[PDB]
Amino acid sequence: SVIKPEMKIKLRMEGAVNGHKFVIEGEGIGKPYEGTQTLDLTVEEGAPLPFSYDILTPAFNRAFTKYPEDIPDYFKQAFPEGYSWERSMTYEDQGICIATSDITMEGDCFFYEIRFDGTNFPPNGPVMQKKTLKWEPSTEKMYVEDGVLKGDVEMALLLEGGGHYRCDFKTTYKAKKDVRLPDAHEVDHRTEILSHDKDYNKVRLYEHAEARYSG
């Protein structure tokens, strides 16, 4: 197996949100067969970020999804070559983000090149006013079409004061070579900001993910 029980992560995200250009770099560790990973993120350009950091965390690797034996693992099968994804994040107040990620591998380390762009967030909405607490845990529905793996999920950010703020994810995952294509399945996701400094210039981010059938 090309994917070791413990793997290092290195990443660079670049983009803009409502025009504000930013650059974020990260390094971390993950356990691909356990479907967990922890990442240390640093804002390198654009600090202090003027928008909610939570909109970014989904963009920071489904190789860190734990797959049972009877569901082919699209993501692990794609290595050493790797895979990429394109994702749209449509928020209920018409803010919209588009992100892409190219995932490669060298030695015992995964590398992500992430682009992240967002626009039309209302100036007094919960994103630009940083009123979001965290993402509710969610279930992504995975299915194959046009020869690649798609994922849809309706997401929700909890708000200061007790509300929720919805977002629809649509993602296309593309292996760099041909692999066994799975039947439709689901992926249970949980993310958690473990720690951060005052302006979120330093953030430690954790994610768990595990695949299963609907039943």
| 3-class DSSP assignment, residue 58 | helix
**Rg of the Cα atoms in the chain:** 17
Residue 33 structural domain: 7-212
Q: At which residue do the structure tokens 């996701």 appear?
A: 189
Query: SS3 of 166, please?
Result: strand
**28 in a structural domain:** yes
**Residue 55 within a domain:** yes
Residue 131 in any domain: the answer is yes
Q: Positive or negative, the Cα torsion across 98, 132, 19, 196?
A: negative
Residue 127 within a domain: yes
Q: Is 34 contained in some domain? A: yes
Q: Tell whether 1 is covered by a domain.
A: no
Which residues, in sequence order, are bridge partners of residue 102? 84, 113
CB crowding 26-55: b at 16 or more within 10 Å, else e: bebebebbebbbebbbebeebeebbbbbbb
Question: Does a structural domain hold residue 170?
Answer: yes
Who's near 102: CB < 8 A, 6+ residues apart? 82, 84, 112, 113
DSSP state of 77: H
Q: Is residue 2 part of a domain?
A: no
What determination technique applies here? X-ray
In order of 3, 138, 172, 189, 213, the CA distances from 152 in angstroms are 26, 11, 9, 12, 15
* Listed residue (209, 180, 207) closest to 71, CA to CA: 180
Residue 171's DSSP bridge partners are 87, 151
Q: Which two tokens stand for residue 92?
A: 């209920």
**83: CATH:** 2.40.155.10
Cα-Cα-Cα-Cα dihedral sign, residues 198, 202, 208, 211: positive
Return the DSSP state at 75. Answer: H
Domain count, the chain: 1
CA distance 164 to 156: 6
Separation between Cα atoms, residue 132 and residue 58, nearest integer Å? 14
